[PDB]
Amino acid sequence: RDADTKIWNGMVGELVYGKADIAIAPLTITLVREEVIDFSKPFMSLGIS
């Protein structure tokens, strides 16, 4: 979400504004994304390597 206009963009922006129903994609579960959309339990384990 670009604070400038507090507009969520990208795959999150398709979900918050309802133009797409689901995002099955490499999307990292973070804190700011929790406030507007809800994730499932994370299907893939990854770490900084």
């Binding site: 990208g10 398709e14 797409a20 689901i22």
Partner: peptide
Amino acid sequence: TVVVTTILES
């Protein structure tokens, strides 16, 4: 129908 959004990343 259900719309699946995703990014183009291999």
